[PDB]
Design a protein around this ligand. Structure first.
Ligand SMILES: *[C@H](O)C[C@H](O)[C@H](O)COP(=O)(O)O
Length: 252
């Protein structure tokens, strides 16, 4: 018997960027994560790991017959510093390791201190490098630190103007990460700029249960209709959600 929660949970699984971003990460932990991404009901959209683990992850995904699971990574992370040369160097290294996607942290503290230009320039530099390599760029704005709706909107806007392919709520590394309100605000920016075709949305950080995921897809479906949230336009950033989705589906 189909239910709303089973329908949402299978969608969320297929849209997941299955993540491990810990100081104690090892090859063994990344290999296990790759195996976890290959589920009895389908594959996650991607994995997300630190750049140094990309080569061993690629090998693992290939050997288990899921070369289509994308490899995302993070740069300028988690602090979102305003040194463009460092963020760009990290992005270029992520590309060289073999990333399919880079999730870069926007210089949100700089924006809070009144500097809008540095975020534009940082995202644009990283976008140029990624685009040349056929790599997607997601931009993490850190909604939990920005806090104010106007600042969330402005960081989203600047990121889109600079070429972001996705806007992502959070690093998962601060006290407040994804919220339904933050998701609505960011998706409203996509709407207001008319960039539904070219910009996806990624809630991240603290999305732990199947019910949590359902709340985020409900907002996407309201705003853009239920066909918009495909893997080019929607991802879940989550280290600890997949088991909950599989349980909801009876395969966990
Ligand atoms: C971007 O890769 C950030 C990740 O989506 C988050 O770190 C995941 O947060 P948790 O699921 O670990 O809370």
């Amino acid at each position: 018997h189909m239910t709303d929660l089973k329908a949402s949970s299978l969608r969320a699984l297929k849209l997941m960027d299955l993540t491990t971003l810990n100081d104690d990460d090892t090859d063994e932990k990344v290999i296990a994560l790759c195996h976890q991404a290959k589920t009895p009901v389908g594959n996650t959209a991607a994995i997300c790991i630190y750049p140094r683990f990309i080569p061993i992850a690629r090998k693992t995904l290939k050997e288990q017959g899921t070369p289509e699971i994308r490899i995302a990574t993070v740069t300028n992370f988690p602090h979102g510093n305003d040194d463009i040369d460092i963020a760009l160097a990290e992005t270029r290294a992520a590309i060289a390791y073999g990333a399919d996607e880079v999730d870069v942290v926007f210089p949100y503290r700089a924006l809070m201190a009144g500097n809008e230009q540095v975020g534009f320039d940082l995202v644009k530099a990283c976008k140029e490098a990624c685009a040349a390599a056929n790599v997607l760029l997601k931009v993490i704005i850190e909604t939990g630190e920005l806090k104010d709706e106007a600042l969330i909107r402005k960081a989203s806007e600047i990121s889109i103007k600079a070429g972001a392919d996705f806007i992502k709520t959070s690093t998962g590394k601060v006290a407040v990460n994804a919220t339904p309100e933050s998701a609505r605000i960011m998706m409203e920016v996509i709407r207001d700029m008319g960039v539904e075709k070219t910009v996806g949305f990624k809630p991240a950080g603290g999305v732990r249960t199947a019910e949590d995921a359902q709340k985020y897809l409900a907002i996407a479906d309201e705003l853009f209709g239920a066909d918009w949230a495909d893997a080019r336009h929607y991802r879940f950033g989550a280290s600890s959600l997949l088991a909950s989705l599989l349980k909801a589906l009876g395969h966990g």
